Amino acid sequence: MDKIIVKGARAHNLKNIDVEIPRGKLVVLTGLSGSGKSSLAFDTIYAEGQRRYVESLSAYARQFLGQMEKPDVDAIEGLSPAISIDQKTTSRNPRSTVGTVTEIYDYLRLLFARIGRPICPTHGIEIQSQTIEQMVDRLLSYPERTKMQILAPIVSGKKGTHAKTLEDIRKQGYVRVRIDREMRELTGDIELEKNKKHSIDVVVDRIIIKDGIAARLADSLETALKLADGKVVVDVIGEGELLFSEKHACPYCGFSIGELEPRLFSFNSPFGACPDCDGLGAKLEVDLDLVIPNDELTLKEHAIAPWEPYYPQLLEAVCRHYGIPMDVPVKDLPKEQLDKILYGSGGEPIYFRYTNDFGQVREQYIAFEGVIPNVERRYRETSSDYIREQMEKYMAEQPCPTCQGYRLKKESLAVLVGGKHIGEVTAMSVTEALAFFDGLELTEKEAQIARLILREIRDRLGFLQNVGLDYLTLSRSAGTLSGGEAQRIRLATQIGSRLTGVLYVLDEPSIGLHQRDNDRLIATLKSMRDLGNTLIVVEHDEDTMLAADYLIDIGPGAGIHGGEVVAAGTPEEVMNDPNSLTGQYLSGKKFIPIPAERRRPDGRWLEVVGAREHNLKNVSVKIPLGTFVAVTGVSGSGKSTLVNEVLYKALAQKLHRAKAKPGEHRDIRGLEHLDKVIDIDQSPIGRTPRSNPATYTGVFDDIRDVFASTNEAKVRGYKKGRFSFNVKGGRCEACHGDGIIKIEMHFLPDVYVPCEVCHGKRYNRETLEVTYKGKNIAEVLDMTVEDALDFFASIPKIKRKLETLYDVGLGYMKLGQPATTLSGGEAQRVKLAAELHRRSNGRTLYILDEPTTGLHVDDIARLLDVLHRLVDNGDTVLVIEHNLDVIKTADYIIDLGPEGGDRGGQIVAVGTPEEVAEVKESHTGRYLKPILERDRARMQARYEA
């Protein structure tokens, strides 16, 4: 009908709820973190929507799908085929690019196939293919009474008499030839000098342009072409020469390309893939920078990383031999001393005696190879996934020298459209490419053949621009993207589908998107909506909820406290509902208060100097320590690059001797102001179901100790291994301690189906016979963090760890919920739980990437309480954010790049939120200034009453 109705859903924490959702309108689900938004939107509606359709694709599909586990719902009528847009269904697997995922690159292949003009690499001439028809036509183009001279280029500048020739075009009975530019009569006693080059062009027929001259031209052309192996010269009189050859081949060198097909431009096909790399575009060779961490480390104390505890004594051998000193800061070493040890003696024998691990001496007489060819050789020769991975650590990816990293054949790159070939177009940014196709100038036929293709390309690029991804390149690897970037890329791709009658389910599409470009997102969503489709968007953003048609608020609280439907109607009706916790924030009843004062920076500053990694413009910044710092700026400004790729990696290689190669920068000062830098990543916790909050926090380690110490375990001799999750002693031998069997879904994403032997309890029958206060290990692993700390108020050591998970924002999630099923924000927060409670010496720096992701404003409050508590104890908290409710709370903000892409990568404004708010050139402050003034008045309104 005109609305989708769902009856009695109980996905996870849902309380047998009924809910109506308006068809074909922008519906927005909201609530606190873990109130059950995903349980309804994704685990219920989208699950049924996908299943019901895919289950009807065939019979085997219905047999395979109908036997598994269907969502926990009574009935849900008014459904439509469902398509989810989240981070869960975006490709992070190599060989894939932005061009491939957005489907744009395929359209590019099609374009190059249709109208692409293939050229000879050597000669740079558009190699053409004809039948005789198209040959005659062009010759007919010239006006009435036009003359020419058909020449069959029999010989083209070849040294040699050609006496074997001149007899035979004379044997046949020709008369008119052209030798070394001068034309001559046959039987004219012609002789050519042996060691001299000669250009012979036989003069077949010579015509006047008149009526019906076709058949004669024709015939003469066939003659001439049969003479010089399908090669003919059409020397015009008055103008210049014209040449034919037929088939995709060059008239001057043989080089051929046959036919223009799409797969000729694909790097997932041998029809297009480069030979010297097999369409990878990336080699894998030793980086000089990885071999030596710092350019100034004592060679006596293992300056070279790979050769580190035979080799240390080889070092001694070559050093002795060449006179290379041991006690050395590599930086001051002469270049040859380093060239010998790094690249080899080049055949010269080096004496080398060494004591084995046993103790016996064995002298040799080797021709030393070097440190780099050592790594390459040992990595290349071994067929072990262990040794390889041990040597790959000192290697990096370097663009294929043959294909220039374009992954395609040299003849595939020979085809160009607008003077640019496929790879060059791929290497542009979305802006650059959009501009390219705007300014691209074609012919009548070309544009008429490729109208439908060009419109699609332009539209897709424009979509990527709308979603705000107009900075990244089409050649950008898929795996190198962020979560938001990937989700939004899938969003644009999906916009390109133009589907109708589809129930889209988006999860927080404003993730990693500056507030400025919010309206655009909203604008495109509705467009999708206005294409006869229905959107169910799970958000927390204000404007996304204000521009919404309908608006459902889910569950007062999280976990067992939520799972209900608080308020539901227009964003004006939910706004005017006291029960809705969310409405209290939109109306302004409850809000996040601006600090009375901001922590003025002391004398401690980090100084990043000369940062020029990606789109950074020789940038130099000063980060204040002991304060809440927010690095803001539009997406594409390179916040990730500065904060993570440059700062964190340098600080890590310095403070913890990390091996990650830091981004291009001059130097970083104030390094003495702190001891440890913790980057609380947003990457998942574990990659197997073996990992969970309890495991990652270390709680599960202690939790086995209490079971091992209980009465029954003592008399059963179970220890802290029988209750161990990954230990054969007591775990379910069927699932091998996984608890959940992973089924193989071919085109659909893989599904976790509970182990039918342990029923998901993850342990065997006898292991769970051992009880602790009326509950076994499977039962306690199933407990909620809140219920857990309420259960373990007993042991202080368990308690102080669970308390971290509680303060963090969670406490609605279970101890044994597998890490593969955790939201990115949830994972980041479980890590925040690990770093939360530590004895702070006031000299450590935390780095959080968008810790807002997946949180309600009300949750942002508590989280900010936690972080500001970390700042209070002397530590420094750095945060990459777009969420204004956090930016305003910060004591110091560093705004990056005006606009994104190459238009940016430079500091727009630094200082306090107010100091940046009064910067007109900053979009951040342009959107922050009215929020500062809004909530500032809200407080004075409250304070006056």
Q: Would you tell me which residues interact with a second copy (CB under 8 A)? A: 59-60, 63, 67, 103, 106, 130-133, 136, 214-215, 218-219, 246-247, 452, 456, 496-498, 716, 732-734, 757, 764-766, 769
Total residues contacting Zn ion (rule CB under 5 A)?
A: 16
Q: Does 277 bind Zn ion (CB under 5 A)?
A: yes
Nearer to a second copy, 496 or 809 (CB): 496
DSSP per residue over 133-167, as a string?
A: HHHHHHHHHSPTT-BEEEEEEEEEEEES--HHHHT
**751 near Zn ion, judged by CB under 5 A:** no
Residue 20, amino acid: E
Q: Which does 215 bind (CB under 5 to 8 A by kind): a second copy, Zn ion, none?
A: a second copy
User: Of residues 756-785, which lie at the interface with Zn ion (CB under 5 A)?
Assistant: 757-758
Decide if residue 119 touches Zn ion (CB under 5 A).
no
403 contact, one of Zn ion, a second copy, none, CB 5-8 Å limit per kind: Zn ion
788 contributes a contact to Zn ion by CB under 5 A: no
By CB under 5 A, name the one of 62, 123, 159, 362 that touches Zn ion.
123
Residue 186 binding partner per list a second copy, Zn ion, none, with a CB distance cut-off of 5 to 8 Å that depends on partner kind: none
Stretch touching Zn ion by CB under 5 A, among 89-97, 122-130, 316-324, 821-829:
122-130
User: How many whole angstroms separate alpha carbon 608 and alpha carbon 24?
Assistant: 50
Nearer to a second copy, 278 or 766 (CB): 766
User: For Zn ion, which stretch binds (CB under 5 A), given 39-47, 250-258, 376-384, 637-645?
Assistant: 250-258
Q: Give least dist CB 174 to a second copy, A.
A: 17
Q: Report the interhelical angle of 796-808 vs 699-708 (nearest 10°).
A: 150
Is 252 one of the binding residues for Zn ion (CB under 5 A)?
yes
Q: For every residue of 283-341, which 3-state class applies, written as one string?
A: CCEECHHHHCCCCCCEHHHCCCCCCCCCHHHHHHHHHHHHCCCCCCEHHHCCHHHHHHH
Return the number of the residue (671 or 743) whose C-beta is nearest a second copy.
743
For a second copy, the closer CB: 722 or 882: 722
Tokens describing residue 358:
């046993």
Which CB, 64 or 311, lies closer to a second copy? Answer: 64
Contact call for residue 650 and Zn ion (CB under 5 A): no
Report the residue from 400, 461, 836, 893 that binds Zn ion according to the rule CB under 5 A.
400
CB 821 within 8 A of CB 692: no
Backbone angles phi, psi at 128, to 5 degrees: -115, 160
Phi, psi of 884 (to 5 degrees): -65, -25
- Provide the terminal-to-terminal Cα distance of the chain, rounded to the nearest Å: 50
**Helical packing angle, 518-529 and 451-466, nearest 10°:** 130
Going by their DSSP bridges, the two strands 148-159 and 232-236 should be labelled as: antiparallel
Q: Binding Zn ion by CB under 5 A: which of 68, 75, 163, 253?
A: 253
CA dihedral 481, 487, 490, 494 (to 10 degrees): -160
* Among Zn ion, a second copy, none, partner that 348 touches (CB below 5 to 8 angstroms by kind): none
Q: Specify the residue, 9 or 758, whose C-beta has the smaller distance to Zn ion.
A: 758
Q: Which is nearer to a second copy, 21 or 495 (CB)?
A: 495
Q: How far is 99 from 106, CA to CA, in rounded Å?
A: 8
- Smallest distance from the beta carbon of 495 to a second copy, in angstroms? 12
| CB neighbour burial string for 90-111, b if at least 16 within 10 angstroms, e if fewer | bbeeebebbbbbbebbebbbbb
Nearest distance from C-beta of residue 781 to a second copy, angstroms:
18
What residue 452 binds from Zn ion, a second copy, none (CB within 5 to 8 A, per partner kind)? a second copy
716 binds, among Zn ion, a second copy, none (CB under 5 to 8 A by kind): a second copy
Residue 250 binding Zn ion, by CB under 5 A: yes
Looking at the DSSP bridge assignments, the partners of residue 31 are: 554
**Of 716 and 862, which CB lies nearer to a second copy in the complex structure?**
716
User: Which token pair is 379?
Assistant: 């990595």
The CA distances from residue 771 to 445, 539, 708, in Å, are 81, 42, 10
Of 27, 155, 403, 805, the residue at the interface with Zn ion (CB under 5 A) is 403
Q: How far is the CB of 261 from Zn ion (least distance, A)?
A: 16
Give residues with Cβ within 8 angstroms of 941, minimum separation 6.
none
Can you tell me the distance from the alpha carbon of 693 to that of 636, in angstroms, rounded to the nearest whole number?
33
C-alpha 641/C-alpha 652 separation (Å) is 15
Binding site for Zn ion (CB under 5 A): 120, 122-123, 250, 252-253, 274, 277, 400, 403, 732, 734-735, 755, 757-758
